[PDB]
């Protein structure tokens, strides 16, 4: 493995504050980050193009990890959707690549959101996971307005081992997630 | 069988003898079928090519 | 009038009619009930007639429970036809009803109001009946 500031922060700062905040008797009881799953549910590229490429190439720059295509489970007439059409990109970020992306997501990406007033405290999973949604992909530093062609957003799933929202919100705020309320 | 789902013979490409009968959907599969099949005359497996029945 | 809203199949073969009623033999809701003594296909019209009779006697008062439902399609060929050429069309619905069935119950009413209302109802029915009162035998079931 290697040294990322957020990772070293999780052990040095966030783990002891968690234990003294919650009283974990076992060192594996204390919440951990598990994975970061990024979902671009496009559907614009259903048939109108294989723009999935220029959007996976930019997901590949943001995460360092090549996305994988997702295909339509069922057919849906109202959606103009045949079963099996390529309608999105998903990439599972774990371990150090998870830290590096989370580190930049907090340090540069979320602040670059305009009219940003903090992450929604209500969006916790009910079971200790978090999800947020972005409307632009140029919020990230690896993406420039010259390199873009169309604004695409995403869903970000951060999974933790915390059993509760209460533990997970402490885990993510201590790491540096600005929550609105 | 149908007008688009046609019957066809498989001809051993080495001794030219038709050895098998089968079908295909010529719209879905326009190219001539090529399949390895055992030729009783050549007593060995060989490339077989579709011809008109 | 009663009838199923939907049905898997439009036409049923004709019943048999053996045996005491399968269930619904004990007073379940009201104080007094009306009991079938003989088997029959009770039509929806018979039910609706016994029911209105008990309403116009309760002068909109009391409670009326109808514990039989006409779910069995009843078929009849058009007049003067010959046999065959398939089953006749559905012209009505009956509820299979066998001895021991509580068909109707009443409550919210005096013993004299209920006994008379149930008596009038039985005159609308193509079978003999018998009026019962909620006993402990009922409440033990």
């Amino acid at each position: 493995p290697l040294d990322v500031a957020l990772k070293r922060k999780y052990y040095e700062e966030v783990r002891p504050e968690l234990i003294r905040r919650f009283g974990y008797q076992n060192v594996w009881e204390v919440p951990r980050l598990e994975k970061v799953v990024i979902n671009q549910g496009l559907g614009e590229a259903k048939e109108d193009a294989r723009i999935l490429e220029k959007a996976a190439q930019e997901l590949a720059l943001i995460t360092g990890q090549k996305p994988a295509v997702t295909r339509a489970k069922k057919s849906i007439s109202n959606f103009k959707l045949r079963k099996g059409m390529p309608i999105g990109l998903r990439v599972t970020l774990r371990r150090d690549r998870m830290w590096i992306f989370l580190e930049k997501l907090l340090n540069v990406a979320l602040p670059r959101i305009r009219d940003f007033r903090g992450l929604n405290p209500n969006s916790f999973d009910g079971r200790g996971n978090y999800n947020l949604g972005l409307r632009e992909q140029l919020i990230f530093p690896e993406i420039t307005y010259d390199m873009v062609d169309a604004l695409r957003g995403m869903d970000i799933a951060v999974v933790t081992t915390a059993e509760t929202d209460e533990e997970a919100r402490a885990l993510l705020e201590l790491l540096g997630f600005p929550f609105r309320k | 069988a149908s007008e688009v789902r046609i019957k066809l013979l498989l001809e051993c490409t080495e001794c030219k003898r038709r050895n098998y009968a089968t079908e295909k959907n010529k719209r879905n599969t326009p190219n001539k079928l090529e399949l390895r099949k055992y030729c009783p005359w050549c007593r060995k497996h060989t490339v077989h090519r579709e011809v008109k029945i | 009038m009663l009838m199923p809203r939907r049905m898997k199949y439009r036409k049923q073969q004709r019943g048999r009619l053996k045996g005491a009623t399968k269930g619904g033999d004990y007073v379940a809701f009201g104080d007094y009930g009306l009991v079938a003594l003989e088997p029959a296909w009770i039509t929806a019209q018979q039910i609706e007639a016994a029911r209105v009779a008990m309403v116009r006697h309760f002068r909109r008062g009391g409670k009326i429970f109808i514990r039989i439902f006409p779910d069995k399609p009843y078929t009849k060929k058009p007049l003067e036809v010959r046999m065959g050429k398939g089953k006749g069309n559905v012209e009505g619905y009956v509820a299979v009803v066998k001895p021991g069935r509580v068909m109707f119950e009443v409550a919210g009413v005096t013993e004299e109001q209920a006994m008379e209302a149930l008596r009038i109802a039985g005159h609308k029915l193509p079978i003999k009946t018998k009026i019962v009162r909620r006993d402990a035998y009922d409440e033990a079931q």
Partner: protein, 154 residues
């Protein structure tokens, strides 16, 4: 509460012969015994119409025993509307489930209760169309536990 009923043991008499003889085939059981019995039909009728599965009936078996029972089942002949068999549950100290009546200061006439045979009450009192409450808000005298989910409307 409470009542008494003569009860005699049977072995190989046909239930049809007993019923024809104006008697009521029956059984007696708990965790420790199981006996085939019969009560006299008319005698049982006047007790059960009052005692009715809520109240204790003490069986006076000819062998001197006075076993306290609760009626737990009455199968009827569906044609004639006449009882044709009785299950007498021999009460002993272990906690049982039974139906207790409800008298109000009206869906449920009674309620299922887990209780010891010592603590068997006569009443469970209620309070003051169309309105209604649930068994959650209920009295519960000493020794009795609501033997349902309180989602029951009363």
């Amino acid at each position: 509460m409470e009542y008494r009923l003569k009860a005699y043991y049977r072995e190989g008499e046909k239930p049809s012969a007993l019923r024809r003889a104006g008697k009521l085939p029956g059984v007696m059981y708990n965790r420790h015994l199981n006996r085939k019995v019969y009560v006299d039909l008319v005698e049982f009728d006047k007790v059960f119409r009052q005692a009715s599965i809520h109240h204790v009936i003490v069986l006076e078996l000819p062998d001197g025993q006075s076993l306290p029972t609760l009626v737990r089942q009455v199968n009827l002949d569906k044609r004639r509307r006449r009882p044709e068999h009785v299950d007498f549950f021999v009460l002993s100290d272990e906690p049982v489930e039974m139906y207790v009546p409800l008298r109000f200061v009206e869906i449920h006439r009674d309620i299922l209760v887990k209780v010891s045979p010592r603590n068997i009450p006569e009443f469970i009192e209620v309070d003051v169309i169309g309105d209604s409450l649930h068994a959650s808000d209920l009295k519960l005298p000493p020794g009795v536990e609501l033997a349902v989910s309180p989602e029951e409307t009363i």
